[PDB]
């Protein structure tokens, strides 16, 4: 049960963390964002070319061990 999220911070670096996609989208996105110390207010997540959030679980859409999610962050303030 491992997931790899690569932040799109202009040449950013991928980070490995332990999260469950069968729990909540916002929970996972917030967990990875915090680990990288990024702005949660202006942050999005894309999986399989699709944006999830209220979906809660990802198993219904197809959960896999060792998947990869894309983390985006905008510059604001």
């Amino acid at each position: 049960m491992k997931i790899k999220i690569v932040p799109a911070v202009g040449g950013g670096s991928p980070l490995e963390l332990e999260v469950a996609p069968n729990a909540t989208v916002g929970a996972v996105r917030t967990k990875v964002c915090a680990m990288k110390k990024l702005p949660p207010d202006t942050t999005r997540l894309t999986y399989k070319g699709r944006a999830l959030k209220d979906t809660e679980t990802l198993e219904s859409l197809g959960v896999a061990d060792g998947d990869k999610f894309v983390l985006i962050t905008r510059t604001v303030g």
Side-chain angles (χ1 to χ4, degrees):
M1 308 105 101
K2 272 168 97 97
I3 53 142
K4 239 196 180 118
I5 312 102
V6 52
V9 290
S13 214
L15 227 69
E16 66 226 320
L17 247 306
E18 53 126 33
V19 193
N22 70 309
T24 5
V25 178
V28 188
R29 171 171 93 183
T30 301
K31 265 260 95 168
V32 58
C33 274
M35 260 58 221
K36 314 235 64 250
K37 314 297 285 220
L38 277 173
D41 261 79
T42 173
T43 193
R44 240 199 171 81
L45 250 294
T46 1
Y47 184 61
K48 214 216 95 209
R50 266 241 267 291
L52 322 169
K53 248 174 285 123
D54 212 40
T55 57
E56 255 235 327
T57 174
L58 230 176
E59 312 217 277
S60 231
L61 323 185
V63 62
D65 56 293
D67 289 334
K68 50 128 76 192
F69 298 76
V70 185
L71 181 148
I72 190 138
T73 181
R74 239 272 200 283
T75 1
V76 295

